[PDB]
């Protein structure tokens, strides 16, 4: 049919989506969560501070054991940090120094890297020779790599700077499934606890849920008014929080198909760089461009606490699987552990 | 106390020493950023010396690192901040673009966006006006006023080139902090690298004086 007819059909479907969304708006999260007691002031201290890096830190990820973490910086080095003792387990000399993302395999055997260069590098931590080396170079992407997350020891899903998100196979090193739903740049990813679905944030203020196996969009959320820099899954896997440059964080529910609550405040005019959840999901820790990190109560949507142990932008924010401690990287080249 | 963790601490200290050596090496090297519409001009600039393309060349016992971002074709707002520490930025625009399809206006828009960027507040810009030889003939054939209706002057290479230089320079709102080193180059032999080296040395002097507190 003609383009105008297709646009009319799209508008009618959009109106139907609006009607469906409003029909399910029984109540807001605030009035229902008013029945629970406020979390109260949350005080955290910097038990451990890491000064190994010499350049700006941009991404980090916690391991399954809740002991080892991997950090990435533009100096071109990946450092596996022993949180308890601060020892440097490994130091990977990156081929490309322009790295803005990293990931840790669930089993700890492999790590991921990516950034301005479109190639994705996977390193073997448990090689016989004892020296970490590159296993594969996934260069199928055309745009700059934005985020990477390990689904298993053989499958990895990464989001690039182009409009396409790809699922990769370590055994063959080819794009098994490619996602092209997003129209703008894709910033961050987040794997569900069941490792079956994942949400991707994009610069077009659109959050879309993808099926790892089926490989098509399942839901779309458009509650933000700017680019979505960060996204993370709820511990129970039925919700996720979105961080955006418009100085507001929104929690989306997969069943309700709409935002439940908005985290924003008048003094906070800066953007959000990273977002993470605690083990229980009660506390939402989100990074901010100002020299501090704010802890938000996911239910009551209030500033439980503020971490002002940084003097530069808080690029990344990682939380241990068991919730023992929270790691907050920043551009000051120092990584700190909070609990 | 520790029994075997002391070996891990020793390994960590050795890794830290290697990291310090690498950081010193990186600090000694000077980083340069390449920008400009059109692959031909940037290719000519590179020869006169898949994502990011890195070119390494040493001039007068100084190691120069140049980064290519044209091939990325992505929104600059999401990755331009990565180049905060670049000592200087090289902008390449062909003077002949004024008659092709509007390209000069796009180059001016890109220069205005880069020069007024918050991240590049304290980074100098080196402007290279490429294809002077082609501009010589284009002025003789096409007038400069096609893309600049406000322009009014003699149709000569000197006047038109000077007018282009002023037009590009006035876009710098931060005139107190930024310094634009405009230059003319078509196929200069051991002259372009001298100019870029001089500009980088001046930027290094400015940074050193700022560090010492005089600036």
């Amino acid at each position, epitope marked *: 049919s003609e383009l105008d007819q297709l646009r009319q059909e799209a508008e009618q479907l959009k109106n139907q989506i609006r009607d469906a969304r409003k029909a399910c708006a029984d109540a807001t999260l605030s009035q229902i969560t008013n029945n629970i007691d406020p979390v109260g002031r949350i005080q955290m201290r910097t038990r451990r501070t890491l000064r190994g890096h010499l350049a700006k830190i941009y991404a980090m990820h916690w391991g399954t054991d809740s002991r080892l973490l991997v950090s990435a910086s533009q100096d071109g080095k990946l450092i596996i940090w022993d949180s308890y003792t601060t*020892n440097k387990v490994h130091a990977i000399p990156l081929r490309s120094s322009w790295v803005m993302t990293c990931a840790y395999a669930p089993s700890g055997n492999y790590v991921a890297c990516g950034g301005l260069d479109n190639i994705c590098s996977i390193y073997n931590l448990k090689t016989r*020779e*004892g020296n970490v080396r590159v296993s594969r170079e996934l260069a199928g992407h055309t745009g700059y790599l934005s985020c990477c997350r390990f689904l298993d020891d053989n499958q990895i899903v990464t989001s690039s700077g182009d409009t396409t998100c790809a699922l990769w196979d370590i055994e063959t090193g080819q794009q098994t499934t490619t996602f092209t739903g997003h129209t703008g740049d894709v910033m961050s990813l987040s794997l569900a606890p069941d490792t079956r679905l994942f949400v991707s944030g994009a610069c077009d203020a659109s959050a879309k849920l993808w099926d790892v196996r089926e490989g098509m969009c399942r839901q779309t959320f458009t509650g933000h008014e700017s680019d979505i820099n960060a996204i993370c899954f709820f511990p129970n896997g039925n919700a996720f929080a979105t961080g955006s440059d418009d100085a507001t964080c929104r929690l989306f529910d997969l069943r309700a198909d709409q935002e439940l609550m908005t985290y924003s405040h008048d003094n906070i005019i800066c953007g959000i760089t990273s977002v993470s959840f605690s083990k229980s999901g009660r506390l939402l820790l989100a990074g901010y461009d100002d020299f501090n990190c704010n802890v938000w109560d996911a239910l009551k949507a209030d500033r439980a606490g503020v971490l002002a142990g940084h003097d530069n932008r808080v690029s990344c924010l990682g939380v241990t699987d068991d919730g023992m401690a929270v790691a907050t990287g920043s551009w000051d080249s120092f990584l700190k552990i909070w609990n | 106390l520790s029994a075997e963790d*002391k*070996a891990a601490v020793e390994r960590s200290k050795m890794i830290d020493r290697n990291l310090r050596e690498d950081g010193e090496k990186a600090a000694r090297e000077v980083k340069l950023l390449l920008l400009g519409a059109g692959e031909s001009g940037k290719n000519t600039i590179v020869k006169q010396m898949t994502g990011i393309v890195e070119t390494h060349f040493t001039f007068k016992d100084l190691h120069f690192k140049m980064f290519d971002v044209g091939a990325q074709r992505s929104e600059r707002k999401k990755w331009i901040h990565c180049f905060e520490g670049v000592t200087a930025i090289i902008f390449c625009v062909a003077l002949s673009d004024y008659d092709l399809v509007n390209r000069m206006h796009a180059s001016m828009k890109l220069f205005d966006s880069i020069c007024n960027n918050k991240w590049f507040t304290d980074t100098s810009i080196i402007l290279f006006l490429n294809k002077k030889d082609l501009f010589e003939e284009k002025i003789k054939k096409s007038p400069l006023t096609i893309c600049y209706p406000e322009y009014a002057g003699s149709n000569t290479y000197e006047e038109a080139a000077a007018y282009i230089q002023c037009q590009f320079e006035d876009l710098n709102k931060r005139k107190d902090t930024k310094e634009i080193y405009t230059h003319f180059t078509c196929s200069t032999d051991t002259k372009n690298v001298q100019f870029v080296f001089d500009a980088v040395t001046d930027v290094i002097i400015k940074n050193n004086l700022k560090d010492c507190g005089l600036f």
Partner: single-chain antibody
Amino acid sequence: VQLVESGGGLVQPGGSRKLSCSASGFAFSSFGMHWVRQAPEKGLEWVAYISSGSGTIYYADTVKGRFTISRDDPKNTLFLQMTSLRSEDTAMYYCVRSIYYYGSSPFDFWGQGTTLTVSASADIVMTQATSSVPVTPGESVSISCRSSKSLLHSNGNTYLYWFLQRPGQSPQLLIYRMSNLASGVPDRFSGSGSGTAFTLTISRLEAEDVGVYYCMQHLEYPLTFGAGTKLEL
């Protein structure tokens, strides 16, 4: 990964020799070395240890000062120099690589070793309960040992390693830290302990398991070793 060693022979008492080993297939500089000696009838015994950075060099009490250990990372070769060796030194020496980090597997690889012949306290003691136990294919056997001091460090890691010396070849690491199996070791092996009493379980015994089983403690130097338990098929 190979470790070729040379420098054996027969020498009269009071002489001096320099054992040498060539390391290939792995990063020698990143791996710390150890030296272990086999008496003709007795068990393994540690000699010396040089770290990756050539620092924190340690020697056993019976060889302190008399022997020295040096390494050349650029040449990827290890030299052990022996001076004024006595009759008690007659043994077969093995070179062992080691790497120290969380999750590491030190003493995973052992060299073939060289034969050396001479013509005519304050350490943890490995009290092996038994010296020899008969076994049959398809059966299960438990090997237990006693330690003077509990190896359970305050960090929760007990420093207990197990080694198997099949006849005609060097020892092979099986379990390290009594809870992790070395690479290439069948999963049927299992170990457990309470920090002072240890037991090694070998389910579904296979003919390739014949040999002498040796213990190791790494809590405090010197790395004293047990008598060794031999299994006969």
